[PDB]
Symmetry: C3
Subunit: 184 residues, 3 copies
């Protein structure tokens, strides 16, 4: 028996979705409400594709151009698996990170590495740095720890170093976008 990242990647698989509008990935944050976190540049009609092949309509709740974060609500949700979210403030340089995606809907894409830099100490301000490859194949998807908990959302808009939006900020700006949509 060989060590692998496949046993934790399989439990996370249904929470990571394909986004068709023009492709990218997304993450199910709330299954009951069908709230999916993805990237603004990916969407500038939206459809979401699960791992099991199921297709759903999705409406843009709102976005933040500066963080490249966009919140989507799937139209009539059912049998959805949501991701566990971790406190990104507890992240340390050297922690292991896995960047997961599912574009085209044909299967999971994963890259591995470490948390390289936090804050203004690398190369934006609020962003997370990782040596795990962030490309068009996992952009919009999840950045997880070895427990399979969301520590950030990958963004390819900006060497071997990648950017992710920390989960705490991704959660807060989703709440602010939900609240605004509730005044509307």
């Amino acid at each position: 028996p060989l060590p692998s990242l496949a046993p934790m990647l399989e439990k996370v698989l249904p929470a990571v979705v394909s986004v068709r509008v023009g492709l990218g990935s997304g993450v199910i944050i709330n299954a009951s409400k069908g709230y999916v976190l993805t990237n603004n540049h990916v969407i500038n009609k939206i459809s979401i594709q699960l791992n099991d092949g199921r297709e759903f309509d999705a409406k843009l709740i709102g976005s933040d151009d500066q963080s490249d974060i966009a919140l989507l609500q799937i139209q009539n949700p059912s049998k959805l698996t949501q991701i566990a979210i971790a406190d990104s403030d507890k992240l340390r340089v050297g922690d292991f990170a896995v960047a997961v995606g599912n574009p085209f809907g044909l299967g999971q894409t994963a890259t591995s590495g470490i948390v390289s830099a936090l804050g203004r100490s690398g190369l934006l301000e609020n962003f997370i740095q990782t040596d795990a490859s962030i490309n068009r194949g996992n952009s919009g998807g999840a950045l997880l720890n070895l427990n399979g908990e969301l520590i950030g959302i990958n963004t390819a808009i900006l060497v071997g170093i990648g950017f992710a939006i920390p989960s705490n900020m991704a959660r807060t700006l989703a709440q602010q976008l939900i609240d605004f949509g509730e005044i509307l």
Copy 2:
């Protein structure tokens, strides 16, 4: 005592060769002297780790998969690689990409199996092809993609998003070698 990838890399070292306009190659059949390499890389000469030089004949290639089969002229004391079932591969499995160009020594990159088939790139023809975040460059192209046991899972191809590398899976390269051996 530190954990390292060098112990498994030392047992695999004689099976990875220097294809001499240079590159790497893998000994699949010790007795017959069958060496798997890339088409773009390729008179042909092969150089072992121990410095031994051998003549090699081209017995067939596939432009689409960028694979090429070579047979070592007058083989002797050859170490072949163990081959693994690439169908049993899962995204997240650890991968090590080894090479030996110029014959000066072993080159290795580390990573994981990133995507299988058309999952990472939906381009027609990309089916079966394994994806890895282990760097695939001119220094290990033609060489072996290995698991933590040192068994061949793929043949490294430095052809094509950025940060991801492509390799021919072991089942596909073994079943292409069989076709090239006959016709």
Copy 3:
């Protein structure tokens, strides 16, 4: 409890300095700091925010190595140095930096190639190859093993193609630069 590279990175943090580039404290008492000749009035900034003046002792253009002496040193932490002759392709490597003292930058990987094995270019016979990303953010800094001991000095001036001056050579050139500046 998750495995991480953060527990070893925290003990090594004070030995890596801000120089724009990085540098490594080799002798705490004398304040000798190893950095890249290409990044070189010089000021050094510690992790704790302390800023010191530094004088150029000497440099080696061929190895891209420069040795600096901290003017009036105090409470310095030096790095443990490992025998780079004992390195093997496949050994794990961590490339650490701290440009502008704002925080630690780290990349992870393996020792990829040694004796000019990766690129048949004259002059690379003395250097180390790594698949750990070597960029402007860790160039001048330390290449470490899993024990937190120096195995090399990152040099970005020369895909997983990163270069580092091995620790044995970097130590030797420092003594030779000390001795020379003594005869003068």
